[PDB]
Design an enzyme around this catalytic site. Structure first.
Site, short mmCIF file in Angstrom:
data_model
loop_
_atom_site.label_atom_id
_atom_site.label_comp_id
_atom_site.label_asym_id
_atom_site.label_seq_id
_atom_site.Cartn_x
_atom_site.Cartn_y
_atom_site.Cartn_z
N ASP A 31 0.72 -1.31 -0.01
CA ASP A 31 0.04 -0.04 0.02
C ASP A 31 0.81 1.44 -0.06
O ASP A 31 1.64 1.55 0.88
CB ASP A 31 -1.06 0.00 1.16
CG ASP A 31 -1.74 1.13 1.26
OD1 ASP A 31 -2.26 1.46 2.39
OD2 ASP A 31 -1.88 1.73 0.20
N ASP A 214 -3.07 5.52 -4.63
CA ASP A 214 -3.24 4.40 -3.69
C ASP A 214 -3.37 3.12 -4.47
O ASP A 214 -4.27 2.66 -4.80
CB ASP A 214 -4.35 4.74 -2.77
CG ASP A 214 -4.25 4.07 -1.45
OD1 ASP A 214 -5.35 3.96 -0.69
OD2 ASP A 214 -3.15 3.43 -1.12
C1 LIG Z 1 -6.64 -3.14 -4.25
O1 LIG Z 1 -6.62 -3.18 -3.08
C2 LIG Z 1 -7.31 -4.03 -2.49
O2 LIG Z 1 -7.94 -5.06 -2.95
C3 LIG Z 1 -7.27 -3.73 -1.16
N1 LIG Z 1 -8.04 -4.49 0.13
C4 LIG Z 1 -8.99 -5.45 -0.07
C5 LIG Z 1 -9.42 -5.68 1.34
C6 LIG Z 1 -8.71 -4.82 2.14
C7 LIG Z 1 -8.63 -4.66 3.42
C8 LIG Z 1 -7.78 -3.39 3.98
C9 LIG Z 1 -7.01 -2.96 2.96
O3 LIG Z 1 -6.14 -1.60 3.34
C10 LIG Z 1 -6.03 -0.59 2.49
C11 LIG Z 1 -5.06 0.51 2.64
C12 LIG Z 1 -5.59 1.38 1.46
N2 LIG Z 1 -4.63 2.49 1.56
C13 LIG Z 1 -4.70 3.33 2.68
C14 LIG Z 1 -4.78 2.42 4.06
O4 LIG Z 1 -4.49 3.30 5.04
N3 LIG Z 1 -4.87 1.28 4.00
C15 LIG Z 1 -4.95 0.42 5.13
C16 LIG Z 1 -6.14 -0.10 5.61
C17 LIG Z 1 -6.13 -0.92 6.94
C18 LIG Z 1 -4.98 -1.31 7.57
O5 LIG Z 1 -4.96 -1.83 8.85
C19 LIG Z 1 -4.04 -2.58 9.31
C20 LIG Z 1 -4.47 -3.52 10.43
C21 LIG Z 1 -3.59 -4.69 10.46
O6 LIG Z 1 -4.12 -5.93 9.78
C22 LIG Z 1 -4.69 -6.02 8.63
C23 LIG Z 1 -5.26 -7.36 8.28
C24 LIG Z 1 -5.37 -8.38 9.17
C25 LIG Z 1 -5.92 -9.72 8.74
C26 LIG Z 1 -6.44 -10.03 7.36
C27 LIG Z 1 -6.38 -8.76 6.51
C28 LIG Z 1 -5.69 -7.57 6.90
O7 LIG Z 1 -5.62 -6.71 5.92
C29 LIG Z 1 -4.36 -6.72 5.06
C30 LIG Z 1 -3.60 -0.90 6.98
C31 LIG Z 1 -3.68 -0.04 5.83
C32 LIG Z 1 -7.14 -3.23 1.67
C33 LIG Z 1 -8.05 -4.05 1.26
#
Ligand SMILES: COC(=O)Cn1ccc2ccc(OC[C@H]3CNCC(=O)N3c3ccc(OCCCOCc4ccccc4OC)cc3)cc21
Length: 328
Positions: A31, A214
């Site tokens: 990301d 992004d």
């Molecule tokens: C083409 O892209 C896709 O298909 C993306 N996509 C599909 C489902 C989805 C969910 C979150 C995401 O994440 C998207 C990013 C986006 N950019 C800004 C941002 O801040 N993000 C982001 C969001 C959530 C996050 O959570 C971290 C928690 C750890 O834990 C994270 C975690 C733990 C267990 C299982 C999965 C998981 O997600 C990676 C980290 C980064 C993008 C996603």
């Protein structure tokens, strides 16, 4: 170095990394819109559905793991999700690095529990790293093995699924010449978009709106007002969680363009509607959706997978710029 990616129904592009000794493998998204490394921890209570079907990281099976344990926290529109900071050898596309990552102990379930991949690798700048932790790509630069303080993305049309190139670009997946756009306020892979256009009626983003490049985002996003305007003004109906249009009437919806630093990036109906079929009965979804992003970063737009699928993207930290080229 190149990281092979996998495409899950043109909405999720992930790769593989290795944490610990021996290497514990994780499926992850790279990301450019975040800056930390997050993996579901083994110490993640099973009371969280996100921690039941994704590989968990067990510090207990790593000879290289080093304990820190600083609690990290990040609230994400369904927010909450937290955990602690740990250190250990991660491997990406052959390269090895001693990186600091977060082990998720708590997770708001969705959207995660629907992720075909397990974690996220922050390709962002150090300026936006929780705990102000050194980002992974930054660490890889420290070794001085790369050729360019840059890295490129390539999302494919699905059904090779994709590819990331560390320290360079890959000519096999793009044609024409990269036309670059400088970063507004370095610290974010964000650029100064100069108006979105629906073909004839160039009504949107008039003046000077912002745009995020992004890679971790699947669709193209803009403020809720903006999207509403752009939506109906296409014949697109609004649903519970995504706009659509009778499938049979998809192939003749207007073209969308993004005036970005000198050029007009255009997406056609084929580029933004999942044409499940052409039935005049069933509905078909648009790879576009509302999504309101909070400051200081927004409300900016978000050029995610939909955009990237068509235009090969390069992020050049060396000169705080970003290039785009017809993807092949
Ligand atoms: C083409 O892209 C896709 O298909 C993306 N996509 C599909 C489902 C989805 C969910 C979150 C995401 O994440 C998207 C990013 C986006 N950019 C800004 C941002 O801040 N993000 C982001 C969001 C959530 C996050 O959570 C971290 C928690 C750890 O834990 C994270 C975690 C733990 C267990 C299982 C999965 C998981 O997600 C990676 C980290 C980064 C993008 C996603």
């Amino acid at each position: 170095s190149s990281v092979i990616l996998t495409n899950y129904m043109d909405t999720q592009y992930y790769g593989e990394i290795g944490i610990g000794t021996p290497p514990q493998t994780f499926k992850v998204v790279f990301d450019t819109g975040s800056s930390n490394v997050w993996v579901p921890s083994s110490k993640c209570s099973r009371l969280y559905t996100a921690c039941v079907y994704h590989k968990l990281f067990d510090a207990s099976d790593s000879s290289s793991y080093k304990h820190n344990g600083t609690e990290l926290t990040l609230r994400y529109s369904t927010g909450t999700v937290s955990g602690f900071l740990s250190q250990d050898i991660i491997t990406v596309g052959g390269i090895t690095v001693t990186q600091m990552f977060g082990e998720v102990t708590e997770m708001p379930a969705l959207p995660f529990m629907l992720a075909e991949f397990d974690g996220v690798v922050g390709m962002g700048f150090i300026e936006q790293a929780i705990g102000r932790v050194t980002p992974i790509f930054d660490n890889i630069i420290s070794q001085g093995v790369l050729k360019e303080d840059v890295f490129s993305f390539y999302y494919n049309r699905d059904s090779l699924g994709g590819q990331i190139v560390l320290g360079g670009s890959d000519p096999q997946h793009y044609e024409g010449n990269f036309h670059y756009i400088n970063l507004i306020k370095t610290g974010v892979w964000q650029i100064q978009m100069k108006g979105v256009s629906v073909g004839s009626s160039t009504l949107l983003c008039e003046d000077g709106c912002l745009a995020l490049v992004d890679t971790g985002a699947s669709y193209i996003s803009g403020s809720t007002s903006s999207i509403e305007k752009l939506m109906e003004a296409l014949g697109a109906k609004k649903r519970l969680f995504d706009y659509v249009v009778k499938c049979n009437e998809g192939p003749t919806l207007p073209d969308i363009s993004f005036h970005l630093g000198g050029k007009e990036y255009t997406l056609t109906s084929a580029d933004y509607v999942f044409q499940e079929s052409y039935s005049s009965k069933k509905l078909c979804t648009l790879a576009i959706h509302a999504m309101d992003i909070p400051p200081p970063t927004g409300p900016t737009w978000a050029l995610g997978a939909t955009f990237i699928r068509k235009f090969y993207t390069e992020f050049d930290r060396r000169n705080n710029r970003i290039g785009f080229a017809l993807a092949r």
